[PDB]
Design a protein around this ligand. Structure first.
Ligand SMILES: O=C(O)CCC(=O)c1cccc2ccccc12
Ligand SMILES: O=C(O)CCC(=O)c1cccc2ccccc12
Ligand SMILES: O=C(O)CCC(=O)c1cccc2ccccc12
Ligand SMILES: O=C(O)CCC(=O)c1cccc2ccccc12
Lengths: 258, 257, 256
């Protein structure tokens, strides 16, 4: 399934794999590597150094592997790494790393990035995440697996979005969102847990109840987070699902969304 | 000539004789374009899609793409746009899903401003304005003359009533009755669009009957069941109040309060 | 320098070393100054002047007509100065005859991806408009202002020198010089001291502006009493005169 439209500009240092497609008026820039079966639409701008894995799909008007704009981050080389089976919709902007942080922006596998979403310098996205239309990761954002950020979710620099978490549309996130937690509003506020997400992805009823207890332990009982960690220790040893919640509290860099 | 020679026209596309297409635009398989329509440069049209007459579609617009929505599995769904519409810079419009009616529908005399998004299965009527970055998530019904201010977000299945108004940055999760003004995240009911009613030449008598109708729904501690009973009389007298009352009766997600 | 896949209207006015990328349009009555790089997939429309050492990124539409129902095809203008960065998919509309028939941008401005500069807006120098910031129309942004991501500004609002909006701010009244605003609707929080240090303000000016803020926001004064009370400090510190003038010139009212 290989088709390179001759109206595309492929840099001589660019590398295409088996069954790669590139649509008309797209740019595949110097030091861009595209893996097996990846389909690039028309009017795409790819810049490097960038590595894209297998069976990805990048839509028109997207700018993937651009430099972060503030000419105060003005160092090179900086990397973008994209895994496999990712969908990047119309007009998505993805920026490479900065030498004054990770020197890399990282995206894993099976992610859906919907139209006009922004992924800022040095962000890390895991696997099976959904960033709905116009979601903006300001920079240095960590989104763990199965997270869903609803349309127009803004995320401040350095925030961690926990596994299976959920933001409502127009949420503005200024602190870490623990794993499984649902946040709404500007500024973002914890509501409940993504119980629906746990169910759809086959979480045991015991796991789900231990996470309902785990939520109370952290949010409702007036405990210091050290007190909360010690309280969760046992349920965390029983339930890998609770340990994921505990780990997100523990590693929270400047507080949790309350 | 009127079709730029740097444009890609699929052989299966049907274009009325005076249609213009700018350079580096794509008119995909099973795209129909009616008389007097101008497609600018850098436009992607995908089908199956019917665009009517005297429309204008600006650079960087994606009209007729598949929804990324997980429940779409490549079914042969449709997009219909009527006549006299303006689609500005970078607008996205997605085709329908078979789970609903298999069609995204836009009417006539609509102004859809830059980076607006019209989600799978949405229905827009006539003379609507979607300001910059308005996003209809999917299955959204926007009735005639509705104005959605910039960065207005609309949840799946919401109904936006005729002559309604949203303030900028409004996040709508519940239905907006006809005539109602909503503001904020989450959206809150403030009043009725009296400025829009006067702009359209409504009668003093119809405006007054709608002023009183708002009070009955929103300011008398009535349940909606009770409010609907109380509106029956004035709804029987005034078509404008019938439209308001019908929008509440048809408000499946509940009404914005 | 001019990619042969670009379209340059004959009536365009490109200076010696201007670069235009592939599949970009430099339309009629579009002037571009020395050292300016037009990226690929850019649309320029005129009447428009673009100064020197500018960078305009892909999928930008610079100089389009406002879709505003009050515009009607008149030959309104867009003027951009020097050393500006206009990022991916930015929209800049030309003016209307209802105001000064001109949209204006000064020097050293950073306008990030999908930002919108509506008809008749006036941006000064060394401003940052972060991603998806929107100036609805007739918005004045004075020098060194920072508007964070998805800041929305209602028509006619003035954004004062060194002011700061937090992400998702929705501004419906003027923001005085130096003031930090957040939320929808925007509310005043504090002053932009990081901005004052970035400018090498003396601690004396920074202390005077710290005082000036309290006099306006924290001492239950009316604007007029605040303006009267600020005359001493304003006559002494130009920095405070900037604060004071920005409140004096807000006949709409100030973000509270
Ligand atoms: O069809 C898509 O939208 C994805 C791949 C693509 O853009 C493409 C690849 C090769 C040749 C083409 C000729 C015309 C239009 C698109 C293409
Ligand atoms: O279900 C929820 O809570 C929000 C739904 C939502 O954010 C969404 C979904 C799909 C496409 C969209 C496009 C634009 C804006 C929002 C969306
Ligand atoms: O709080 C912070 O750290 C971010 C401040 C902000 O709004 C921002 C800054 C830089 C790039 C961005 C891209 C998209 C959205 C927001 C931003
Ligand atoms: O807020 C006002 O002053 C007008 C209402 C509005 O939302 C608007 C109007 C025109 C262009 C716009 C561009 C971007 C965002 C908002 C607008």
């Amino acid at each position: 399934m290989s088709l390179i439209d001759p109206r595309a500009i492929i840099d001589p240092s660019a590398r295409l794999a088996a069954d790669v497609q590139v649509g008309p008026w797209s740019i595949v820039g110097a030091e861009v590597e595209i893996g097996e079966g990846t389909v690039i639409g028309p009017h795409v701008v790819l810049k490097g150094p960038t590595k894209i894995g297998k069976h990805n799909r990048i839509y028109q008007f997207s700018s993937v592997g651009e430099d972060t704009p503030d000419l105060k981050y003005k160092g090179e080389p900086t990397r973008l790494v994209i895994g496999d089976h990712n969908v990047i919709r119309e007009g998505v902007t993805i920026h490479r790393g900065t030498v004054q942080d990770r020197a890399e922006t990282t995206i894993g596998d099976h992610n859906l990035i919907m139209a006009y979403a922004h992924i800022g310098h040095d962000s890390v996205i895991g696997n099976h995440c959904i960033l709905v239309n116009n979601t903006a990761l300001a920079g240095h954002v960590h989104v763990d697996d199965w997270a869903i950020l609803s349309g127009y979710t803004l995320v401040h620099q350095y925030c961690r979005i926990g596994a299976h978490s959920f933001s409502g549309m127009g949420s503005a996130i200024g602190k870490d969102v623990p794993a499984y937690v649902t946040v709404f509003g500007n500024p973002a506020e914890a509501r409940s847990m993504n119980f629906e997400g746990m169910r759809r992805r086959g979480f045991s009823s015991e796991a789900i109840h231990a996470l309902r207890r785990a939520y109370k332990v952290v949010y409702r009982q007036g405990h210091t987070v050290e007190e909360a960690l010690a309280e969760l220790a046992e349920s965390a040893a029983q339930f890998p699902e609770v340990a994921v919640f505990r780990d997100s509290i523990q590693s929270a860099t400047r507080g949790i969304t309350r």
